[PDB]
Amino acid sequence: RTRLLDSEIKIMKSEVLRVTHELQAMKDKIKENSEKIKVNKTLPYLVSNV
Amino acid sequence: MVLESTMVCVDNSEYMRNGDFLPTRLQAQQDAVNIVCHSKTRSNPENNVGLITLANDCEVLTTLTPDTGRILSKLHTVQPKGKITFCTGIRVAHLALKHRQGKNHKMRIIAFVGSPVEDNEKDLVKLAKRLKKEKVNVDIINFGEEEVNTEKLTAFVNTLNGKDGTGSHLVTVPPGPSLADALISSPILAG
């Protein structure tokens, strides 16, 4: 049952990897959402033709 | 709570890879880092913990910072390989703690030695009376194998303190099969 406990602690290591996913997802996402706040809230938009 | 700064001094030498100490020696010192980072979470979070090695380099990858979740991420792929130099380890950790943020924090440092170091007792007594003139207690926990009953680090424990500042506690290594938490159970009992 040693490999089962090894995989049990590896489940916690994969939960730490999920926490790394949560960090590099939420932090980077909200920073890029803040840049889209800076760029996209500029509600007067000149429209035009391509 | 209490204000200090404990610098975990891991060993990344090529002797910490077998399984005489429990299912990985990497996992043994890794659980040691787990219990000391949880112990400094249970201590004052105003305090700070940073990583350093004694072998193959003096590797600073994290700052001596009050966060340790990134240190828990830094547990991975440590790859212990090189050659020990703990005698620069004491001084590199001490200048790392002279690069702190506050002076009201004390200096009780741990160290993990797991290899035969070419450390003169004159070297470590220079370091030890240096710490007598630098106010640091050091609680070293012997890992790996250099001697079944370490003496140079016992001499450093002897030459660090006297009559008032006996904060040098040396868990000598049990080089046969001894557990993962039975080694660190005595410093969590008394550092």
Add this chain to the structure above:
Amino acid sequence: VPGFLQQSQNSGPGQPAVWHRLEELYTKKLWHQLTLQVLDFVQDPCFAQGDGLIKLYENFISEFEHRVNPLSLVEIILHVVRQMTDPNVALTFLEKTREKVKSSDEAVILCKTAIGALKLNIGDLQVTKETIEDVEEMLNNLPGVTSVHSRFYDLSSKYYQTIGNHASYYKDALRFLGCVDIKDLPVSEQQERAFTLGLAGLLGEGVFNFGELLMHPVLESLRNTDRQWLIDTLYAFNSGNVERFQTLKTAWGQQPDLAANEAQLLRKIQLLCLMEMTFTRPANHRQLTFEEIAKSAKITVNEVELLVMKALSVGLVKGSIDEVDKRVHMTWVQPRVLDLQQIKGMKDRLEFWCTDVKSMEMLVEHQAHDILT
């Protein structure tokens, strides 16, 4: 299981002092002193009779150790195949320890050097290009091991044996001469390696200045113990293209493999004149006679033309072929090794230039000093 060393506990005199300790080494589950003991079994002086027995035990060490580096596995499987005298079973073990081993201390290059070191029996023309070139394809991270580089010389020198690019032997010497630094093998075989190194560097003629680096210790300590004239005839291909004693004593002592390159060695002495005439002589003479090239070249008048055109085909000189008088004009040449006396004469004419241009410069400025204001 200790019952295997209970029956294989005898390998030498005073032998079970390491075996009763060895059944403390792995039974107390330490494995780095067992890496030391695998080094000791590589070290173990015998007819190598315990290694073909301990091979399955070492496989077991790899199975329930699952960390250690298979460099000692390569150096002990060469001992196992030294016992068993056939690599085809070790080919199966080699493909095995290539398919199951992805070890972190550079397992792929030790696999490719296992292919190289047991390529000695499988033939060296079907597989040399592919996997020996694949070694340095896989050495694209950090070529600083020097053990894989010495074994890489060994397989690239077997590639030199199975003849491809004689001229690549100078670079292969830059990999052996480059690989070794301290002598780490007996001088009593090194000096014959320097012997055949000079011979095979002579057999490959691409760089044609083979006395380029001969302040190199682990060849010069053989140069002053080998025959003393072979080095001087490499110096007769390095410095001066005369003394038929030397450049024919390379046929006197070395009888074979010289007539197969004789005209090309005449070409080498006919470029040794090309370095001479502008290196040693006063500055250039600006126009150099057919007697000069033909005299250092020990050749007729009607070949220095072919010589200077052949030097243009080589591309070491950009010269103008002045032969309206058979007296040749000079341009830039690829230089040869600056000697100690040539360091001193270079200091002479160079400080001549330096302090003369500086002094007459200060004189020009001394005349130009009056109008600054």
